[PDB]
Design an enzyme around this catalytic site. Structure first.
Site, PDB file in Angstrom:
ATOM      1  N   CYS A  85       0.823  -1.180   0.000  1.00 33.09           N
ATOM      2  CA  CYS A  85       0.000   0.000   0.000  1.00 33.09           C
ATOM      3  C   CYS A  85       0.880   1.261   0.000  1.00 33.09           C
ATOM      4  CB  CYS A  85      -0.979  -0.086   1.196  1.00 33.09           C
ATOM      5  SG  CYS A  85      -1.801   1.398   1.730  1.00 33.09           S
TER       6      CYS A  85
ATOM      7  N   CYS B  46       0.011   3.986   2.664  1.00 27.10           N
ATOM      8  CA  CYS B  46       0.432   3.492   3.994  1.00 27.10           C
ATOM      9  C   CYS B  46       1.927   3.779   4.193  1.00 27.10           C
ATOM     10  CB  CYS B  46       0.180   1.981   4.105  1.00 27.10           C
ATOM     11  SG  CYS B  46      -1.520   1.390   3.831  1.00 27.10           S
TER      12      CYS B  46
END
Length: 108
Positions: free
Chosen positions: A32, A35
């Site tokens: 991600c 993230c």
């Protein structure tokens, strides 16, 4: 790390639910991009909010049990827990300035 708690599915209750104060949990995954963008910001917050809160990170691939309990879909999802109870929810990446405002407003 230093001040950040590296949570597991087994350690979540003790680390988050039984903790006497506020825990900012980050649900995230290595693939991600957003993230990974917020990770260094979380380090700074961990430093800066010493004694207000603890930052904790749960990787949702290595620890697949916990996130369904909180209806997590999009990542990163940041949950502000206060003594075991979710007070505030932030989905998606955000800047340091924005995270600060989210925390200051919800910590009171």
């Amino acid at each position: 790390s230093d001040k950040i708690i590296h949570l597991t599915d087994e350690s979540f209750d003790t680390d988050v639910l039984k903790a006497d104060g506020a825990i900012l949990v980050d649900f995230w995954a290595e693939w991600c991009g957003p993230c990974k963008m917020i990770a260094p910001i979380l380090d700074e917050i961990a430093d800066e909010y010493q004694g207000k809160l603890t930052v904790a990170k749960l990787n949702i691939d290595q620890n697949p049990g916990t996130a369904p309990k909180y209806g997590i879909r999009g990542i990163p999802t940041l949950l502000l827990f206060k003594n075991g109870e979710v007070a505030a929810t932030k989905v998606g990446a955000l800047s340091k300035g924005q995270l600060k405002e989210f925390l200051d407003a919800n910590l009171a």
